[PDB]
Design an enzyme around this catalytic site. Structure first.
Site, PDB file in Angstrom:
ATOM      1  N   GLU A 266       1.252  -0.666  -4.920  1.00  0.00           N
ATOM      2  CA  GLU A 266       0.358   0.396  -5.375  1.00  0.00           C
ATOM      3  C   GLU A 266       1.167   1.684  -5.442  1.00  0.00           C
ATOM      4  O   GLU A 266       1.370   2.351  -4.425  1.00  0.00           O
ATOM      5  CB  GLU A 266      -0.828   0.562  -4.430  1.00  0.00           C
TER       6      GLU A 266
ATOM      7  N   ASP B 131     -10.456   2.275  -4.909  1.00  0.00           N
ATOM      8  CA  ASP B 131     -10.135   3.703  -4.824  1.00  0.00           C
ATOM      9  C   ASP B 131     -10.621   4.498  -6.028  1.00  0.00           C
ATOM     10  O   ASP B 131     -10.226   5.660  -6.193  1.00  0.00           O
ATOM     11  CB  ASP B 131      -8.628   3.915  -4.652  1.00  0.00           C
TER      12      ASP B 131
ATOM     13  N   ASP C 251       0.821  -1.202   0.000  1.00  0.00           N
ATOM     14  CA  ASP C 251       0.000   0.000   0.000  1.00  0.00           C
ATOM     15  C   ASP C 251       0.860   1.259   0.000  1.00  0.00           C
ATOM     16  O   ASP C 251       1.938   1.292   0.595  1.00  0.00           O
ATOM     17  CB  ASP C 251      -0.905   0.010   1.230  1.00  0.00           C
TER      18      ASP C 251
END
Ligand SMILES: [Ca+2]
Ligand SMILES: [Ca+2]
Ligand SMILES: [Ca+2]
Length: 494
Positions: free
Chosen positions: A250, A322, A221
Site C-alpha cells: 500500500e 480507507d 501496510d
C-alpha cells in the site's frame, strides 16, 4: 504461463463471528459491542468465522484471501475525548509474534490456512511493520503507550524506550517530504526505527514466523512511511524463505498529480513488492462513480502500462477500508457491475473488498471510515454481482490474456469503452457501455471473422459480436450496445 490471481480482501472483525467465546476476552475486555452500533469497537468477527465462509469465498472464484492484520493488537483502547477506539481493524500491533486473541489462537489460524489451502486459496497477510499503536510520550496511560512485545516479552514503550525502538521526532506534517514521511509518526502511531538492528531483526523474525505457518504473501501496510531500502531488504528476507510469494505494498497516492508518484513507481520497480494501483483506482472511481468520460480511464491505463516496469503485478481495486465504498460514492449497481467487469478484464490482479458482491454499504459521514467497514449481512451466492465475480475469474484461468496480456484500446468515447487483451494467439475483446443504448461505427479487432457469443451470457445485458474479414485487422460491424451493459468476446475455447 504464469498463474492468474483474484483477491478477496477481508477485514476479520467485520466479516463473520464464528466464536462468541473470543468476543470479549479477559485480557482485553471492554472493547466489544455486540449491538454493532459503536463503530469503533470490536464487533466479534474472527478466524473461526472466516474459515466457515471459505466455501462462500471459493464459490466466487477467489484465488487468494488478503486478510487484515491478525497479529496481537493493543489490549487497552485508545480513548480520544472519552471515545473508546478499539484496534478492531488490526493496524495497532502490540506483539507481532502472537495472534490477536479476539480473532483466535495459533490453532484457529493454522486451521484457517489449512482450509484455505484445501480449497486452492492463497493466504495473503496484511503486515504493518511501520509502527505499533497510538501513543503519547507525555502520557503513558494513553492506550498502551505504543508498547512493543516479543512473544509476550516487553521490549519497550514509547515513554520508556530503553532499547531505542522508536523514532521520537513528532508526527508527520509535511506529507510531501519523503524523510518526514519515513522518520516521523503516522498520526500518533509510535513509529518503529527499522535502522535499529533490534527492530530490524525483530520484524524479520516475525515475518519468518508467519511464513512458518504457511502464509503465501504480504500486503505491506503504509509502504511509503518506511525507507525504501529497508523494505527491499524485508522482501529479500521473505524471498529467502519462500519461492512463489505474492508481495504488494500500500503506497498511497492522493490523485493523478500526487508529487510522490515517481517514488511509488521506483518502489514497485525495485523493492520486490508491487503496489496497489491507486492511479487506476482514481480513474475507475472518476468514470464509473463521478460521471467522467472513459478517456480518463484509458489514458490512465495507458500511462500506468508504461510507467511501471511490470504492470501485470499491479493490484487493482475499486474501493477499500480507507475510502468510501463504491456504492457510497455512487449508489448505482449497474456502474458497480461495470467497474467490477473492468478490473476483472484489466491487467494485474483485481481485489474485491468484502461485501461488494452483496452491495454492502453504509453512507454515514460520506461512507468514510469506520462506516466503510460494516458487518457482513447476507451470504447470498445468487446475487448478480456474486455471479459476475464468479464468472470472469473462470476466464482468467482459461487465458493469461486478462492478467498478462497487452492492452489495445479499440474505441473510446465519453460512455463507451472497447479494449482488446492479447496473449499469444489468445484474444479477449470487451465492450462497456455506461451510457444509454448506442450503435458503434467500425471497430478494429484481431479476432478472426465470424460471430462471437457474449462470454457473460447476457448477465450484464451483453450482446453478440459480428466480425468481418478486413484483410489485415478485422472489422467489427453494427455493434449495438444496450445501455449500462458489458459484453465480453473471446476466441479462447470455453
Ligand atoms: Ca468472535
Ligand atoms: Ca490483543
Ligand atoms: Ca516509519
Amino acid at each position: 504461463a504464469p498463474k492468474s490471481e483474484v483477491i478477496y480482501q477481508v477485514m476479520v472483525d467485520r466479516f463473520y463471528n464464528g466464536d462468541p467465546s473470543n468476543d470479549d476476552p479477559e485480557v482485553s475486555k471492554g472493547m466489544f459491542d455486540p449491538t454493532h452500533t459503536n463503530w469503533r469497537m470490536y464487533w466479534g468477527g474472527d478466524l473461526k468465522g472466516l474459515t466457515e465462509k471459505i466455501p462462500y469465498i471459493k464459490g466466487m472464484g477467489v484465488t487468494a484471501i488478503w486478510i487484515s492484520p491478525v497479529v496481537d493488537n493493543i489490549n487497552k483502547p485508545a480513548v480520544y475525548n472519552g471515545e473508546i477506539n478499539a484496534p478492531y481493524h488490526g493496524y495497532w500491533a502490540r506483539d507481532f509474534k502472537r495472534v490477536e486473541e479476539h480473532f483466535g489462537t495459533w490453532e484457529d489460524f493454522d486451521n484457517f490456512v489449512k482450509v484455505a489451502h484445501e480449497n486452492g486459496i492463497k493466504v495473503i497477510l496484511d503486515f504493518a511493520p511501520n509502527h505499533t499503536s497510538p501513543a503519547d510520550e507525555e502520557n503513558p496511560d494513553f492506550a498502551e503507550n505504543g508498547a512493543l512485545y516479543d512473544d509476550g516479552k516487553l521490549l519497550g514503550t514509547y515513554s520508556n524506550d530503553s532499547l531505542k525502538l522508536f523514532h521520537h521526532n513528532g508526527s508527520i506534517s509535511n506529507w510531501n517530504n519523503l524523510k518526514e514521511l519515513q522518520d516521523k509518526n503516522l498520526f500518533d502511531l509510535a513509529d518503529l526505527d527499522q535502522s535499529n538492528p533490534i527492530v530490524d531483526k525483530y520484524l524479520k523474525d516475525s515475518i519468518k514466523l508467519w511464513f512458518n505457518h504457511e502464509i503465501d504473501g504480504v500486503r505491506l501496510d503504509a509502504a511509503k512511511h518506511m525507507p525504501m531500502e529497508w523494505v527491499k531488504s524485508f522482501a529479500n528476507t521473505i524471498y529467502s524463505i519462500k519461492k512463489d510469494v505474492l508481495l504488494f505494498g500500500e503506497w498511497m497516492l492522493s490523485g493523478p498529480t500526487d508529487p510522490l508518484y515517481g517514488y511509488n513507481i521506483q518502489f514497485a520497480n525495485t523493492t520486490g513488492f508491487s503496489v496497489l494501483d491507486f492511479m487506476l483506482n482514481g480513474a475507475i472511481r472518476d468514470v464509473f462513480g463521478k460521471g467522467y468520460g472513459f478517456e480518463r480511464l484509458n489514458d490512465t491505463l495507458e500511462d500506468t502500462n508504461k510507467d511501471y516496469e511490470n504492470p501485470y503485478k499491479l493490484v487493482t481495486f475499486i474501493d477499500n477500508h480507507d475510502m468510501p465504498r463504491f456504492l457510497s460514492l455512487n449508489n448505482d449497481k449497474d456502474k458497480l457491475h461495470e467497474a467490477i467487469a473492468f478490473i476483472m478484464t484489466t491487467r494485474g490482479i483485481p481485489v474485491i473488498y468484502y461485501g461488494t458482491e452483496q452491495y454492502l454499504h453504509n453512507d454515514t459521514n460520506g461512507g468514510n471510515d469506520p462506516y466503510n467497514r460494516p458487518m457482513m449481512e447476507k451470504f447470498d451466492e445468487s446475487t448478480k454481482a456474486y455471479t459476475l465475480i464468479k464468472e470472469l475469474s473462470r476466464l482468467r484461468q482459461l487465458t493469461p490474456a486478462l492478467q498478462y496480456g497487452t492492452t489495445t484500446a479499440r474505441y473510446v468515447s465519453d460512455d463507451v469503452y472497447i479494449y482488446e487483451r492479447q496473449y499469444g494467439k489468445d484474444v479477449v475483446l470487451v465492450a462497456i457501455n455506461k451510457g444509454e443504448k448506442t450503435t458503434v461505427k467500425t471497430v478494429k479487432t484481431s479476432l478472426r471473422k465470424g460471430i462471437y457469443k457474449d462470454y457473460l451470457k447476457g448477465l450484464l445485458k451483453g450482446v453478440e459480436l459480428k466480425v468481418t474479414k478486413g484483410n489485415g485487422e478485422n472489422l467489427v460491424q453494427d455493434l449495438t450496445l444496450p445501455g449500462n451493459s458489458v459484453s465480453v468476446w473471446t476466441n479462447v475455447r470455453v
